[PDB]
């Protein structure tokens, strides 16, 4: 089943952040961590067709700011306490399985921990040699 | 050391697609697979300030269908089509290192091979499966 | 597992009115009693975001007066009339699980058989009695 | 008597939340828990006639956010610290007692703890199988 | 649990064509087989109200002729042509369960293998004698 | 030998609804059950060319709600209402035998009892999950 809970944050067993399915409206999977929606880790995704020659995946992720956070509190402005991400993946209809798994892996590679993009993000850095 | 080559696609140890830094103009880092520009996997990233209190990473991925076209015995290296991924990451400036890191990980988790998103993509599926 | 049948009307163990899931289009869950649409108890619910910091459950209930009309010996199943209940629930996103739960209970308490509201309704009365 | 205090939140004896009558203007029963009006659990209801063929019950409920709350404090914005609910029940004049008690029970069933609507609310979930 | 994968083509056990649910937006369920979208079996359906007392199913089937096109030495999975089927079912709201079931079975019988319509279809024939 | 009687509704062995060929004028085959024409199941079909390379089956089904009307003490076998189904199949002329057979089976599978479409129909449902 594609709609199942999964570990969104692998902290090596200890502080793992799992996210669960919560809704399914209009074919928009929604996973929520165990927190108030304002402080939750959140993921949404959908696979619609787009144009007459490609399908498109649309995924969104919300990551909370943690340090200093008052769990379950009402800390405003939300805009200051959360990071947002949007991913649009466009895959033309001619792609066959093996093509798709690569695309799949590429994404995984791009954001893998220890790789430049990942490193950069976490070091508040930009890109440079 | 963020601008450095890395493996985009990890097929164990054989067909690994490594991608290298090729330019960094106007704050746009651009990596490239080892192919003619007409058929290379390509990645670009940029880190800029957004608003007076946010920052934004913008990453784009290009996955080609590598093939050799032949027009009158004149074989040209081209791509049947390409898949595109586009990511916008917005992070508040209040985000401390620890905070940033989680974002970092969350992303990696989200797209990890084996998790739902990865699954779905790799089977051209929706989340109803 | 929220989209599942449940007993709408509990008359001990005899005339229990159970209602089952029948559709879920456009994020509107719709349960139905076991009757022709022309005479079924019906319930619908939807959960959407409202504003940039609230969520809203919208629930509607239809209680029919089940009867068999006869026009020229042509007996059709219809409803003499229907009673309608409509509920709007607005909850802040700051609401943590524990918070949500109370809401949950509060509602159930409010309408419980034996409490004032239940009484009044069940005797077509006001609160002056 | 319909205007009496009742347990709005059944926490199994221990932390039960009782709500008491507080006002009765224009046939609008008002029950308040024991708190500052800003943090109180609150219930209002009235039975007016509507149209020339149905009576209507109008009930409203306010549920406070509790976790993190500073009892009796002044925590703004109230909009962030409270959940609201509105119920409109319309019952045509031809309904006789037994009809009404069903309607009555239906409501109770709809919101009963352990049932989908209830479950959904409290799990911050939507509806799906 | 109606939006689920099922076998569209039953060839005993070998070439069975299974079709899965992929999306359900705007009340349109879409099922696809596991092929490059450019050449996959497709089924869509919707159940909506029509008029004041009817419901209307609208089902559409798409059967592809799977092949691999090649142009200037570039091969692409394409569909040589497709067969299209369109079905409209209209049902009164008075239709109670048993009734619906019958309707349900009629369709089945209609298209059942071995019965005239199927035979005709599968032999490029019309209905003769 | 396609214009022949067949079983429209298979109820094991009891209430089987058999439908027979009654006429075949102007390329329209008509099958009726054994009831007063005012209230009989009906099926019609035609196979004609369409365009320069397509064939088109046009099948229509009629399911009656059998009852006996009575007016001024005069009873007549009438139909309380009917469910209508309309089907259009379009097939390229390149479709060779095997192809056609598949198309043939798809339809069967589509409407097969136990598969989603049938289930939905027979339960006043839509396609959900």
Swiss-Prot record, chains A, B, C, D, E, F:
Residues covered by region (Viral RNA-binding): 30-103
Main location: virion
InterPro entries: Levivir_coat, Phage_RNA-type_capsid
GO molecular function, one term: RNA binding
Keyword annotations of the record: Capsid protein, RNA-binding, T=3 icosahedral capsid protein, Translation regulation, Virion
Highest taxon, organism lineage: Viruses
GO cellular component, as recorded: T=3 icosahedral viral capsid
Record GO biological process: regulation of translation
Localisation: Virion
Function: Capsid protein self-assembles to form an icosahedral capsid with a T=3 symmetry, about 26 nm in diameter, and consisting of 89 capsid proteins dimers (178 capsid proteins). Involved in viral genome encapsidation through the interaction between a capsid protein dimer and the multiple packaging signals present in the RNA genome. The capsid also contains 1 copy of the A2 maturation protein. Acts as a translational repressor of viral replicase synthesis late in infection. This latter function is the result of capsid protein interaction with an RNA hairpin which contains the replicase ribosome-binding site.
Subunit description: Homodimer. The capsid proteins form dimers that assemble by group of 5. Twelve such pentamers are linked together with free dimers. The homodimers binds to the viral RNA via an operator hairpin, but also to many other RNA sequences in the viral genome; this interaction probably shifts the virus from the replicative to the assembly phase and ensures specific encapsidation of the viral genome.
Family: Belongs to the Leviviricetes capsid protein family.
Protein name: Capsid protein
Species of provenance: Enterobacteria phage GA (Bacteriophage GA)
Organism lineage string: Viruses, Riboviria, Orthornavirae, Lenarviricota, Leviviricetes
């Amino acid at each position: 089943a594609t709609l199942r809970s999964f570990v969104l944050v692998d902290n090596g067993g200890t502080g793992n952040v799992t996210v669960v399915p919560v809704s399914n409206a209009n074919g928009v999977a929604e996973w929520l961590s165990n927190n108030s929606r304002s402080q939750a880790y959140r993921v949404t995704a959908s696979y619609r067709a787009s144009g007459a020659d490609k399908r498109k995946y649309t995924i969104k992720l919300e990551v909370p700011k943690i340090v200093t956070q008052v769990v379950n509190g009402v800390e405003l402005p939300v805009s200051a306490w959360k990071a947002y991400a949007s991913i649009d993946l466009t895959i033309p209809i001619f792609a066959a399985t093996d093509d798709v798994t690569v695309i799949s892996k590429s994404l995984a590679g791009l954001f893998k921990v220890g790789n430049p993009i990942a490193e950069a993000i976490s070091s508040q850095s930009g890109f440079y040699a």
